[PDB]
Design an enzyme around this catalytic site. Structure first.
Site, PDB file in Angstrom:
ATOM      1  N   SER A   1       0.927  -1.194  -0.058  1.00  0.00           N
ATOM      2  CA  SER A   1       0.148  -0.103   0.120  1.00  0.00           C
ATOM      3  C   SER A   1       1.020   1.255   0.037  1.00  0.00           C
ATOM      4  O   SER A   1       1.837   1.472   1.011  1.00  0.00           O
ATOM      5  CB  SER A   1      -0.773  -0.052   1.128  1.00  0.00           C
ATOM      6  N   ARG A   2       0.883   2.080  -1.013  1.00  0.00           N
ATOM      7  CA  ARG A   2       1.787   3.377  -1.292  1.00  0.00           C
ATOM      8  C   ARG A   2       1.343   4.249  -0.308  1.00  0.00           C
ATOM      9  O   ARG A   2       2.234   5.166   0.253  1.00  0.00           O
ATOM     10  CB  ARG A   2       1.804   3.854  -2.666  1.00  0.00           C
ATOM     11  N   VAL A   3       0.064   4.568  -0.174  1.00  0.00           N
ATOM     12  CA  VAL A   3      -0.557   5.593   0.866  1.00  0.00           C
ATOM     13  C   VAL A   3      -1.230   5.387   2.182  1.00  0.00           C
ATOM     14  O   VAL A   3      -1.520   5.950   3.067  1.00  0.00           O
ATOM     15  CB  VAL A   3      -1.113   6.751   0.168  1.00  0.00           C
TER      16      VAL A   3
END
Ligand SMILES: Nc1ncnc2c1ncn2[C@@H]1O[C@H](COP(=O)(O)OP(=O)(O)OP(=O)(O)O)[C@@H](O)[C@H]1O
Ligand SMILES: [Mg+2]
Lengths: 59, 231, 269, 147, 144, 220, 115, 115
Positions: E8-10
């Site tokens: 998950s990037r954010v």
């Protein structure tokens, strides 16, 4: 020898001193090497541990 | 569709679904349409959907379909196999090896699958019995290679007991069909789902460990194995 | 570059997998042959253990040095499933206790991988033998064993131990080290003398446990190889499975490109 | 919160994020997304479910499971099934996105699921090759990224 | 979910405090297990350090398993993550890790219902909750 | 024998029509109560000639540039090879021939490129025919002159197309070759084999050597 | 390449050479991964002869002297059959494989081996 | 990457690092089927240095502490050359591979190896 039982612990070849000594000297002959060392060489455990992990990955 | 409207449950057999896809590719090329990936028609998914979406369970009757499937170049990722598998609820695999053993139905219990094999659909009892049969048959296929490479004496007592139950299960998967009386020389049998579950559940639990495996060959329900063993 | 190269590589891996499959069965057969040669030497070992025991009891006045206060076995062929490393990892642990105490260590090497482990690390040696047949004979081991017996009698060695794998089971090869040196109502008539007999029997007993050790290590080598070749066959299949997916991707891509070129040229002409 | 300890602890999702659910067929891709919608029946996040190129019976089963679990009253279901026109399958994600945007522009929070974005690409490829537009990689149109 | 390539990037900035703090020791345990999982069958004779990592790896994996149509609340998930990180599954058997979890959650829904409602509110973690949880778990271990 | 020729320098239309002309000559004997055999030496060259005519008439192309009806080309030809009942022969002969069933047997030949049976034309014909005899380059270079790969070759008609003596003696030949294909890596370790398996191995090797035959030497 | 046209001796020698080369082509991968000691005594001998046949097929040409520097050679059909029949039979299992590379008739391999 | 631009020392360190990794890439297939234990004594030594060089090329970034939580590292060119030169010479053959992963400078690998 016992009253009930008789055991014969038979040898497979002649144990003459010349033959006995000859094969021991052949073992010394081959054992000879160019880098005999002092006799206190150690710490090679790292190599054997590195290979052990690779051997786990193999199976 | 007409029989379904009558109030019936109907079987639609399609001799080969790959040839339906190819006929669509041929027609699309004749009409001059621009070809898609791997040379198939641009309408590949829509032509499959138009046929497959009519085969369903309505509020009057239900059309169930058995379709033979061909896989090009043994590639399961090819557009035709890929598109067809999206509309399949079950996969029945017939095995040349099983046939040699003598089980004429010849359905492979390990390779064959169904989306209905879920405890939230068939209940916990049917699901556990089916998964129990598949576990024992898997272990026996592994043990057979051990027995071949190293010998039968190399196995534990628990493993030899499993081999004996697996063999009984494997033969109890056989059944004389009414259309096969000419080949089997015996009358046909129609086993209920209730009788099917009860027979395999008993063999898994060991209720029939005293009977010979042959008594569990070409008999139908589990009570018929008991008698075939009595004589 | 294309599907041709991948097709050649899948054929290359499929050829090797069939011979590794055969070598696992070949190894199982040889394992069974080495396990009967293990059982044909127990009678000479269990009875002499009893004779040397009673002969010492009835003659307490003589206490042979062997009865009061390393030989390493390795393979000659490849494909072993870490048979050599696991023992060589127990040899290093045991040698540490003595190197830390300051005691000196003499070594006797049986087999090729033992020599390799010492030439690669500049290790010392007092006796060495290799090229012993998958069927060894006790006579070849006499020479190497004697250099260690003379050492123990002349005080050049304070204790002697045999380092070999033990055949726990077809799937287990326990590396182990055991001490070779140091070790009723009626009485036997002794010809010519009790001392002469004790001196001769002790030599027959040490030469016997060394032969028992070599033969058992050969059974371990065969089992280890059976596992190594099963692993190699399975690994080959995985590579074949991965390559077949790359091949199918290349097959499908070749078809789409050609169709684009045919359509492109026809849309011009 | 998706309600799954594995996802909510190792692969967290925040309000306004785009998180892809990728994998082969019959592994629980729909299961994971439908359970994520069911968990929003008390959070205050309205949900939308877009079914693209799916079987009618599969769509009917999901709606029943949503009402059986008490989640249908918060959900909007947009359906373009496997026998419908390629034009409707290609436009269904934009229609569902427009319905979800109604809540985001008025200061509210929404969650949207696209059941098969790979089936939308197959529907758009069919329309493009029937308008005779030059194809690219795997026969997809040149603007497939922009879709 | 494949924890090796799933990311998950954010998401990090979106977790509640309780799950953000307790989740630290999960992905790492699955990673330590990723390197030992296949070899585990012959790791019973290896170094004690490797065995501790493997024991934890087999437990954490088992706990992550969950069922369809059964969602857990921030509180219920927190209880499980606490026992797994802090250390309450070492005694529990792999086949019991799931049962221990179902029992532990059924327990806190009667013995500490207020603490659950307080954790479901904003999912905030403080010394009181941290102690309140170890107290509740240690009590559960002896009682049920 | 009737020999029908359409050589490489002749018009693509004549090469496209030759199989149908030969089939028509073979159908005379079948429709009149007799039996015939037809060999199409290269159906792949007929497909190449039909592709030339089609692309020059500007017909829409498909896979490997073949026209949309290349499957129908070979299928329309190969479905004529058949066995007809006594009632068809009595109807056609208007009663003249009675009690006799006529037939036309076909042996079409196709060339593969580097063993690729997945090519468009080979895939079509493999699906139209009743069986396939696969010849292999690796077997042919290993001295196995007839080169028939019996592990993948199949006849869907099977035992119904055999006399009683050959049907009884072919069953074990199948088992021995199958056992030889399974135990072919052990030849280099024949000493280390178990006796039962070593007995099977030599039987498999002797049956395999029996299949080798010479050209122009048909056996009764 | 038919016994009726070229004779049985030439035909058998050609098929004999092709059989050895096809068998060597399938043993090449085995030797690469496992090694040469893991082969049977028959296979080790066949691999040695295959490598000699593969080098005895090379030939110095008169039109290629500018590229090699070595003089060209013309071998007659009688000499070719004799040289390959000898290698297959085992009459040259002592000479190294390098003696057969770029020579002509089988006598020049015998002379090359000494040097 | 030219001796006239960066100097011989940096150019040799880079050439040496690449030479080591290239050979390791070539032995991949053999290790895949037979494992590391069948390689030659020198090959085994390179495979060990290649594995260390590979993890020593890893570095925690200051724009990635949010993803990982570990602190970022800035390594000078001088420290970069010194670290890889030491691994190529064998000055670090006694440290475990996992002491080189995400350690920034070589001294941190020495302090990581203490755990
Ligand atoms: N947590 C779970 N517990 C039990 N079964 C589950 C779980 N999650 C998913 N499944 C089962 O997985 C199967 C496939 O799930 P689902 O249909 O959602 O997958 P999908 O990837 O969306 O398949 P499709 O490609 O057909 O759309 C179903 O039988 C479902 O019940
Ligand atoms: Mg789905």
């Amino acid at each position: 020898v016992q009253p009930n039982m008789v055991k014969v612990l038979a040898d497979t070849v002649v144990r003459a001193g010349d033959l006995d000594e000859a094969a021991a000297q052949e073992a010394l002959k081959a054992a000879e090497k160019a880098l005999q060392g002092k006799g206190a060489e150690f710490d090679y455990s790292a190599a054997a541990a590195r290979l052990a992990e690779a051997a786990a990955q193999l199976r | 569709e007409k029989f379904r409207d009558e109030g019936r449950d109907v079987l639609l057999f399609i001799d080969n679904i790959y040839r339906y896809t190819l006929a669509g590719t041929e027609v699309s090329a004749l009409l001059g349409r621009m070809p898609s990936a791997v040379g198939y028609q641009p309408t590949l998914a829509e032509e499959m959907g138009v046929l497959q979406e009519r085969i369903t369970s309505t509020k009057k009757g239900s059309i169930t379909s058995i379709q033979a499937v061909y896989v090009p170049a043994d590639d399961l990722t090819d557009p035709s196999p890929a598109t067809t598998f999206a509309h399949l609820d079950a996969t029945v695999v017939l095995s040349r090896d099983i046939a040699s053993l003598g089980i004429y139905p010849a359905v492979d219990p390990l390779d064959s699958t169904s989306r209905q094999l879920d405890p939230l659909v068939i209940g916990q009892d049917h699901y556990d019995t089916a998964r129990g049969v598949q576990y024992v048959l898997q272990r026996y296929k592994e043990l057979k290679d051990i027995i071949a490479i190293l010998g039968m004496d190399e196995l534990s007592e628990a493993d030899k007991l499993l081999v004996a139950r697996a063999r009984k299960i494997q033969r109890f998967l056989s059944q004389p069909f009414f259309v096969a009386e000419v080949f089997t020389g015996s009358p046909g049998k129609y086993v209920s789902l209730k009788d099917t579950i009860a027979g395999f559940k008993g063999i898994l639990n060991g209720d029939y460990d005293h009977l010979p495996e042959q008594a569990f060959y070409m008999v139908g329900g589990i009570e018929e194995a008991v008698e075939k063993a009595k004589k | 570059a294309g599907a041709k190269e991948i097709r050649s590589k899948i054929a290359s891996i499929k050829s090797t997998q069939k011979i590794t499959n055969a070598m696992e069965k070949v190894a199982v057969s040889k394992m069974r042959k080495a396990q009967m040669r293990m059982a044909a030497g127990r009678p000479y070992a269990e009875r002499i253990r009893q004779v040397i025991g009673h002969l010492a009891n009835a003659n307490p006045e003589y206490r042979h040095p062997f009865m009061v206060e390393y030989i390493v076995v390795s393979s000659d062929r490849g494909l072993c499933g870490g048979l050599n490393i696991n023992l060589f990892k127990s040899l290093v642990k045991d040698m540490s206790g003595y190197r830390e105490q300051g005691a000196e260590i003499d070594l006797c090497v049986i087999g090729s991988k033992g020599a390799s482990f010492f030439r690669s690390f500049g290790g010392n040696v007092v006796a060495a033998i290799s090229h012993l047949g998958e069927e060894p004979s006790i006579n070849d081991l006499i020479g190497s064993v004697k250099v260690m017996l003379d050492a123990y009698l002349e005080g050049r060695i304070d204790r002697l131990f045999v380092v070999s794998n033990k055949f726990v089971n077809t799937m287990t090869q326990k590396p182990t080290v055991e001490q070779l040196i140091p070790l009723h109502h009626w009485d036997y008539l002794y010809e010519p003398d009790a001392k002469s007999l004790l001196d001769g029997l002790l030599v027959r007993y040490v030469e016997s446990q060394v032969y028992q050790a070599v033969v058992e290590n050969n059974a371990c080598e065969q089992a280890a190889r059976m596992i190594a070749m099963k692993n190699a066959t399975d690994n080959a299949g995985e590579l074949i499975s991965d390559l077949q997916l790359i091949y199918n991707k290349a097959r499908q891509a070749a078809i789409t490109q050609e169709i684009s070129e045919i359509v492109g040229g026809a849309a011009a002409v | 919160q998706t309600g799954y300890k594995s996802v909510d602890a190792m692969i967290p999702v925040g309000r306004g994020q785009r998180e892809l659910i990728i994998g082969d067929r019959q592994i629980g891709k729909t299961a994971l997304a439908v359970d994520a919608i069911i968990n929003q029946k008390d959070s205050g996040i309205k949900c939308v479910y877009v079914a693209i190129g799916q079987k009618q019976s599969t769509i009917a089963n999901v709606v029943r499971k949503l009402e059986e679990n008490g989640a249908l009253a918060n959900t909007i279901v947009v359906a373009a099934s496997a026998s419908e026109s390629a034009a409707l399958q290609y436009l269904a994600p934009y229609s569902g996105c427009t319905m979800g945007e109604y809540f985001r522009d008025r200061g509210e929070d929404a969650l949207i699921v696209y059941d098969d974005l790979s089936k939308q690409a197959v529907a758009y490829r069919q329309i493009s090759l029937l308008l005779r537009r030059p194809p690219g990689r795997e026969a997809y149109p040149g603007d497939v990224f922009y879709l | 979910v494949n924890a090796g390539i799933s990311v998950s990037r954010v998401g990090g900035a979106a977790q509640t405090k309780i799950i953000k703090k307790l989740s630290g020791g999960i992905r790492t345990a699955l990673a330590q297990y990723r390197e030992l999982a296949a070899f585990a069958q012959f790791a019973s004779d290896l170094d004690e350090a490797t065995r501790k990592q493997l024991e934890h790896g087999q437990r954490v994996t088992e706990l992550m398993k969950q069922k369809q149509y059964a969602p857990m609340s921030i509180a219920e998930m927190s209880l499980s993550l606490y026992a797994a990180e802090r250390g309450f599954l070492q005694d529990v058997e792999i086949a019991k890790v799931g049962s221990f979890e179902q029992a532990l959650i059924s327990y806190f829904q009667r013995e500490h219902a207020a603490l659950l409602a307080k954790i479901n509110e904003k999912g905030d973690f403080n010394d009181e909750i941290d102690a309140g949880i170890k107290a509740g778990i240690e009590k559960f271990k002896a009682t049920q | 024998t009737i020999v029908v020729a359409a050589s490489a320098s002749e018009s693509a239309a004549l090469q496209y029509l030759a199989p149908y002309s030969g089939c028509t000559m073979g159908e005379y004997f079948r429709d009149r109560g007799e039996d015939a055999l037809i060999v199409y030496d290269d159906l792949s060259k007929q497909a190449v000639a039909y592709r030339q005519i089609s692309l020059l008439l500007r017909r829409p192309p498909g896979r490997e540039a073949y026209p949309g009806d290349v499957f129908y080309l070979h299928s329309r030809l190969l479905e004529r090879a058949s066995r007809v009942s006594e009632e068809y022969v009595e109807k056609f002969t208007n009663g003249a021939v009675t009690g006799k069933t006529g037939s036309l047997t076909a042996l079409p030949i196709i060339e593969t490129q580097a063993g690729d049976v997945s090519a468009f034309v080979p895939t079509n014909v493999i699906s139209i025919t009743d069986g396939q005899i696969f010849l292999e380059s690796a077997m042919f270079n290993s001295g196995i002159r007839p080169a028939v790969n019996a592990g993948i070759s199949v006849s869907r008609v099977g035992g119904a197309a055999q006399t009683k003596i050959i049907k009884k003696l072919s069953g074990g030949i199948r088992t021995a070759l199958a056992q030889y294909r399974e135990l072919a890596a052990f030849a280099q370790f024949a000493s280390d084999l178990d006796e039962a398996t070593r007995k099977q191995l030599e039987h498999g090797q002797r049956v395999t050597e029996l299949m080798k035959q010479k050209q122009y030497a048909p056996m009764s």
